[PDB]
UniProtKB/Swiss-Prot annotation:
Signal peptide: none
Activity control, per UniProt: Efficiently inhibited by Cu(2+) ion, Zn(2+) ion, sodium pyrophosphate and N-ethylmaleimide, while the addition of Mg(2+), Ca(2+) or Fe(3+) ions has minimal effect. Inhibited in a competitive manner by vanadate.
Database matches in Pfam families: LMWPc
Result of knocking out the encoding gene: Cellular protein arginine phosphorylation is only detectable in a ywlE mutant and not in the wild-type strain, and global gene expression is significantly impacted in the mutant strain. Cells lacking this gene are impaired in dephosphorylating McsB-P. They also show a reduced resistance to ethanol stress.
Source organism of the structure: Bacillus subtilis (strain 168)
Keyword field contains Disulfide bond: no
Transmembrane domains' residue ranges: none
Site (Important for substrate discrimination) residue list: T12
Protein known as: Protein-arginine-phosphatase
Alphabetized UniProt keyword annotations: Hydrolase, Protein phosphatase
Inducing stimuli: Expression is up-regulated in the exponential phase of growth, followed by a significant and gradual reduction in the stationary/sporulation phase. Is not up-regulated during ethanol stress.
Catalysed reaction, written as an equation: N(omega)-phospho-L-arginyl-[protein] + H2O = L-arginyl-[protein] + phosphate
Substitution effect: D119A: Completely loss of phosphatase activity
Amino acid sequence: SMDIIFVCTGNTSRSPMAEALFKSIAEREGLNVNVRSAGVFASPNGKATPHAVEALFEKHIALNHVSSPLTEELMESADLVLAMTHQHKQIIASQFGRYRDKVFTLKEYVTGSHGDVLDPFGGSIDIYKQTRDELEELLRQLAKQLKK
């Protein structure tokens, strides 16, 4: 049981979308994983943002999410910590330097190239769908790679 945690700042849009998309993908691929998300600056009271929920609902995936701060406990239990952006990775490694060797951006880990997941902040539902689609492409490739 590999423990994966997707991380962004607020844990209301990209990282919870990644978590829900990847849970679905991994199950269909027969990959045994425990999947979570958290935010380096998250409030504990938050929900996923309406457009994030709707974007996944379109694809018949439920995004029923409560935002969670990234903690030492989560970092200790993780096998991989996949950041949405390279600044998220920097922030994580600053706070949790002992666990640097678990932390990568999603794009560098899967594709080998530096890059940040498309930010849907302030966007219409269609921008959120673009982020969803980019995440799905990355996460389908992640599932294939982790099964090795």
